[PDB]
Design a protein around this ligand. Structure first.
Ligand SMILES: [Zn+2]
Ligand SMILES: [Zn+2]
Length: 230
């Protein structure tokens, strides 16, 4: 039932209704020989839509907007990128040209700039310290500390108890660590624990890539990060 790379051909995007006014957007990516699904989030904010992360790149993101415009019909007015990597900010220029107001922490914007990636226009203050949380429309933005990246943020939708971890949280099918070049392996577990202590009520946990699950994805991720560290 949850879209997999089997139901989504490269360059296309599919939306999945997780709860009322809450969706995940799935896009198939092709990287270094393999193909895999990438998850994003969409949260109804009144009569508008809040988008969490791009679909990696201009084309895919443009396809994302198109799939939203026809399946949902509400205007995407704001967007938040969970970290500076190209798969999460790539497509921001497209979002900006469509009238979407793009956001990201100063930390993320700084890192994207240094990396030469697209840069969300607006800045999200109040998230520079581990454990920081701020309300942003229908969701709560949370910085658990360095993990997959030193700037990664996780998103929680209180009304639906949906937690989007971005690449900070792995799916069960992932047995080994992914790209940990810019990750803080030493802090990742402690950051996961902060996520656990802040959202003990989460019912649906969405990993950066793959099938959603429950809060056990946190421990899974921790198990995988631990093993990699050793
Ligand atoms: Zn990344
Ligand atoms: Zn603006």
């Amino acid at each position: 039932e949850y879209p997999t790379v089997s139901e989504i051909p490269v360059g296309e995007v599919r939306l999945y209704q997780i709860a009322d006014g809450v969706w995940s957007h799935i896009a198939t990516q092709s990287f270094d020989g393999a193909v895999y699904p990438s998850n994003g989030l969409i949260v109804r904010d009144g009569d508008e839509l809040l988008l969490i992360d791009t679909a990696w790149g201009a084309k895919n993101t443009a396809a994302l907007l198109a799939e939203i415009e026809k399946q949902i019909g509400l205007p995407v007015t704001r967007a938040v990128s969970t970290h500076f990597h190209d798969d999460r900010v790539g497509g921001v220029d497209v979002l900006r040209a469509a009238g979407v107001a793009t956001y990201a922490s100063p930390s993320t914007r700084r890192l994207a700039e240094v990396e030469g990636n697209e840069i969300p226009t607006h800045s999200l203050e109040g998230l520079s310290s581990s454990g920081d949380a701020v309300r942003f429309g229908p969701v709560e933005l949370f910085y658990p500390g360095a993990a997959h990246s030193t700037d990664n943020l996780v998103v929680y939708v209180p009304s639906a108890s949906v937690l989007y971890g971005g690449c900070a949280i792995y799916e069960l099918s992932r047995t080994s660590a992914g790209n940990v070049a810019d990750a803080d392996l030493a802090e990742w577990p402690t950051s996961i624990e902060r996520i656990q202590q802040h959202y003990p009520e989460a019912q649906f946990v969405i990993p950066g890539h793959g099938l959603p699950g429950g809060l056990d994805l946190l421990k899974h991720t921790t198990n995988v990060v631990k093993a990699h560290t050793n």
